[PDB]
Write an enzyme that holds these catalytic residues in place. Structure first.
Site, short mmCIF file in Angstrom:
data_model
loop_
_atom_site.label_atom_id
_atom_site.label_comp_id
_atom_site.label_asym_id
_atom_site.label_seq_id
_atom_site.Cartn_x
_atom_site.Cartn_y
_atom_site.Cartn_z
N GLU A 35 0.80 -1.31 0.22
CA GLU A 35 0.11 -0.25 0.20
C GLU A 35 1.13 0.89 -0.43
O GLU A 35 0.77 2.21 -0.65
CB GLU A 35 -1.03 -0.16 1.51
CG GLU A 35 -2.23 -1.22 0.94
CD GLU A 35 -3.22 -0.54 0.27
OE1 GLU A 35 -3.25 0.77 -0.05
OE2 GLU A 35 -3.91 -1.40 -0.19
N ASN A 46 -6.40 10.94 -5.55
CA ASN A 46 -7.33 10.08 -6.81
C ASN A 46 -8.56 10.81 -7.14
O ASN A 46 -8.55 12.45 -6.95
CB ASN A 46 -8.48 9.32 -5.38
CG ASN A 46 -7.67 8.00 -4.78
OD1 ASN A 46 -7.09 7.44 -5.39
ND2 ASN A 46 -8.20 7.87 -3.78
N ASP A 52 -5.53 9.22 -0.40
CA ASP A 52 -5.49 7.94 0.62
C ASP A 52 -3.84 8.27 1.26
O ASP A 52 -3.31 8.89 1.12
CB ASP A 52 -4.76 6.94 -0.59
CG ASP A 52 -6.03 6.67 -1.09
OD1 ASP A 52 -6.90 6.19 -1.20
OD2 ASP A 52 -5.78 5.67 -2.33
N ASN A 59 -8.21 6.12 2.49
CA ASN A 59 -8.66 6.74 2.18
C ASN A 59 -9.65 7.87 2.89
O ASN A 59 -9.95 7.62 3.52
CB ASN A 59 -9.50 6.69 0.59
CG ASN A 59 -10.27 7.00 -0.04
OD1 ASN A 59 -11.43 7.65 0.23
ND2 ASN A 59 -9.69 7.70 -1.40
#
Length: 129
Positions: A35, A46, A52, A59
């Site tokens: 991640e 995003n 994130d 998120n």
């Protein structure tokens, strides 16, 4: 802070993630690896305007507030920046709330594509827990 593999394993276990909700410590280390590459300061924007944050890339659309995410909810009741400190407490406690229900660790895309169904146990091998 960029954690070493076993270093993060020990810290996570220390923070009660080993076997939390039935997920062995290996899952969390593997999720962190893919991640954010063990980096607590990792961030990724995003298209929906959310971002994130942290080692586990939580998120902002639902779990934290960064003051710029449309329709943002702050279910972990924290500024997203809290998910970036060298102190993993915030990320861990928020992750605990996330994994507690819903679809377990399937909530983490990287965990689902690089850890789920593999010898996740390997990520703790040789570690000084």
């Amino acid at each position: 802070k960029v954690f070493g593999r076993c270093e993060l394993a020990a810290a996570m276990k220390r923070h009660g993630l080993d076997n939390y909700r039935g997920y062995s410590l290996g899952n969390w280390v593997c999720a962190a690896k893919f991640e954010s590459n063990f980096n607590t300061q990792a961030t990724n924007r995003n298209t929906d305007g959310s971002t994130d944050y942290g080692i586990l890339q939580i998120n902002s659309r639902w779990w934290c507030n960064d003051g710029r995410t449309p329709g943002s909810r702050n279910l972990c009741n924290i500024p997203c920046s809290a998910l970036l400190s060298s102190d993993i407490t915030a990320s861990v406690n928020c992750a605990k709330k996330i994994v507690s229900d819903g679809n377990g660790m399937n909530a983490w895309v990287a965990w689902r594509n690089r850890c789920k169904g593999t010898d996740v146990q390997a990520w703790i091998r040789g570690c000084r827990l």
